[PDB]
Amino acid sequence: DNVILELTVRNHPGVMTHVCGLFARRAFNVEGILCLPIQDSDKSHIWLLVNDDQRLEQMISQIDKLEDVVKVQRNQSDPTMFNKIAVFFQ
């Protein structure tokens, strides 16, 4: 099964590298990404599609403690959002 991670982050350089770096060093593959800026703010929203995994719980607290991560939520977006997007942009 897959699950969506939703992040509110600051829209500054380097922020996306720190987030995926946590997945990279654990060899945890990210299957889908969507990052959009939030209008009239210095923040962006990030949706990550990842396989559910016993390690994701340890990984959520380390994403939250990153300085430029405002908020992180899991399983609050139905995973098929990326199959919906995939219908328009292959």
Ligand X SMILES: CC(C)[C@H](N)C(=O)O
Would you count residue 16 as binding ligand X (CB under 6 A)? yes
**Distance of alpha carbon 35 from alpha carbon 46, whole angstroms:** 4
Question: Which string of DSSP letters, residue by residue, matches 3-60?
Answer: EEEEEEEE-STTHHHHHHHHHHTTT--EEEEEEEEPTTSSEEEEEEEEE--TTHHHHH
Q: Is 54 in the site for its own copies (CB under 8 A)?
A: no
Rule CB under 8 A: say whether 76 interacts with its own copies: no
Q: Give contact residues for its own copies (rule: CB under 8 A).
A: 11-14, 16-17, 20-21, 23-24, 26-39, 45-47, 77-78, 81-82, 84-86, 88-90
Q: Give contact residues for ligand X (rule: CB under 6 A).
A: 9, 11, 13-16, 20, 23, 29-30, 33, 35, 44
